[PDB]
């Protein structure tokens, strides 16, 4: 049984992306630990690494509004943060005119790939706008890895 | 150790999507070769195949602007190109009015799936607009396969 994780967002969290290890359809086993909102890899080897965030925003102050999602590695040795996977989305669009009330919008982002990882490596899935995090339903926000 | 690749875009490339085999967090091992911007599968079997492109465009001449991303197979025998994975996105929106200056936008696309491949099969991840390719930061553009 291979090192495996599939954690989800904390619904009872607070304009915050906080990974929860223990729910109904998640995984934290075979040596992978959740540690400071980071997945810690037990052994060395090839991992599939993936994540999805769903943003529900409201209003479009500008076309320049950006959503970001990024998975980063912190090697035990180096100890510095490196981006493995990363995407940016501009969800707007037009610009809500004023006197105009803001309308909701939905944007999902998905990241995923395979990487050679080292024992004791840390991994984090981070967004720029946790205030726009939507986890009002399950399956919408999640972070995972399996060793192959 | 299974046939594995995870190549990235050439930053020093030229309105071009050129796959680079040798960087810090990529993979080209166990028989997979990079050959004419195509991943060449060593043995037969089940592969996970995936890719992400990030487009940073500017201006919206029309609602009809399309971004495409597609992974295709070329079997040694047949020798003809077949689409395995394929998505299209319309990033606009409105139409920049004229006298109006163009504004930047970001659109990511992700493709990925598992397929039975044959020894000597070629695989390519192609976009329609390399002029809009954003790799100003790492983790933004990438192509990969692992044998399972």
């Amino acid at each position: 049984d291979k090192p495996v994780a599939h954690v989800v967002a904390n619904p009872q969290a607070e304009g915050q992306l906080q990974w929860l290890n223990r729910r109904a359809n998640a995984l934290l086993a075979n040596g992978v630990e959740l540690r400071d909102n980071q997945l810690v890899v037990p052994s060395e080897g090839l991992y599939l690494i993936y994540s999805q965030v769903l943003f529900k925003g409201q209003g479009c102050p500008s076309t320049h509004v950006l959503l970001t999602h990024t998975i980063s590695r912190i090697a035990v040795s180096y100890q510095t943060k490196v981006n493995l996977l990363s995407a940016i989305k501009s969800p707007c669009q037009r610009e809500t005119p004023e006197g105009a009330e803001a309308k909701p919008w939905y944007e999902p982002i998905y990241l995923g790939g395979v990487f050679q990882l080292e024992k004791g490596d840390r991994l984090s899935a981070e967004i720029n706008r946790p205030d726009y995090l939507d986890f009002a339903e399950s399956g919408q926000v999640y972070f995972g890895i399996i060793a192959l | 150790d299974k046939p594995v690749a995870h190549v990235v875009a050439n930053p020093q490339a030229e309105g071009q999507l050129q796959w680079l085999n040798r960087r810090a967090n990529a993979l080209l091992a166990n028989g997979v070769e990079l050959r004419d911007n195509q991943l060449v599968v060593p043995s037969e079997g089940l592969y996970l195949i995936y890719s992400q492109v990030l487009f940073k465009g500017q201006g919206c001449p029309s609602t009809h602007v399309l971004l495409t991303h597609t992974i295709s197979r070329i079997a040694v025998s047949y020798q003809t190109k077949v689409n395995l994975l394929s998505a299209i996105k319309s990033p606009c929106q409105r139409e920049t009015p004229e006298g109006a200056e163009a504004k930047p936008w970001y659109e990511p696309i992700y493709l990925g799936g598992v397929f039975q491949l044959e020894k000597g099969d070629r695989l390519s991840a192609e976009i329609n607009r390399p002029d809009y390719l954003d790799f100003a930061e790492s983790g933004q553009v990438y192509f990969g396969i692992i044998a399972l």
Partner: antibody, heavy 120, light 108 residues
């Protein structure tokens, strides 16, 4: 114009409570996100809390530094936003500004500030 | 929680000349940088939004630019009425943060 008027500052001992008030005119209040932003010479400008529109449910947001101590609320009927501060700290000392943030971007408008001095 | 550096903290310029304010983000913020003036005994006043778009009622002599992490506010033909502290703000990341501010002295 567009006016924001905050009030209710003054001296409190450490651990104390104090309620701040802000009355708005000159825009459709129920539409907009109201904020408190404080300023001190040591720390400069510091976002404190946001309360978004009805349409969002309230959607309240707090700075890490006041989480669980401060509570933001609004009375759309009165065009009012409130900051109820409890368990006050010396550091909480500063000028507190009522302010509108324009749908997650710019601080559109500012009141003229009200001063909190937390001290024995 | 993005950090904004405004160095130099003080600028001092003869009237008529052009002044430039620096704002640097510790990380990518796209163009979500906004600029404010704060006169003595005053509250902050929004000058420019999203790097370069000036608000209405704001004098033409104010402009901004920059993208990614390096940004600039510019006033040309500076005049004493411009004496203030100037702050930048990012809205790319939650929570929104401010720079420490640059002070403008117009010489005499």
């Amino acid at each position: 114009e567009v006016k924001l008027e905050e009030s209710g500052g003054g001296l409190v001992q450490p651990g104390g409570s104090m309620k701040l008030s802000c009355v708005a005119s000159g825009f459709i209040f129920s539409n907009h996100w109201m904020n408190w932003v404080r300023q001190s010479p040591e720390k400069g400008l510091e976002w404190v809390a946001e309360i978004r529109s009805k349409s969002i449910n309230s959607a309240t947001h707090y700075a890490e530094s006041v989480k669980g101590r401060f509570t933001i609320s609004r009375d759309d009927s009165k065009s009012a936003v409130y900051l109820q501060m409890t368990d006050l700290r010396t550091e909480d000392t500063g000028v507190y500004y009522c302010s509108r943030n324009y749908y997650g971007s710019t601080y559109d408008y500012w009141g003229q500030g009200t001063t909190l001095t937390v001290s024995s | 929680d993005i950090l904004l550096t405004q160095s130099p903290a003080i600028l001092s310029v003869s009237p008529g000349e052009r002044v430039s304010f620096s704002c640097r983000a510790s990380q990518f913020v796209g163009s979500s940088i906004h600029w404010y003036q704060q006169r003595t005994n005053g509250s902050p006043r929004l000058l420019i939004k999203y790097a370069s778009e000036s608000m209405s009622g704001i004098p033409s002599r104010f402009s901004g630019s920059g993208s990614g992490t390096d940004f600039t506010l510019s006033i040309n033909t500076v005049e004493s009425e411009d004496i203030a502290d100037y702050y930048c703000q990012q809205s790319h990341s939650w929570p929104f943060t401010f720079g420490s501010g640059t002070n403008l002295e117009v010489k005499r």
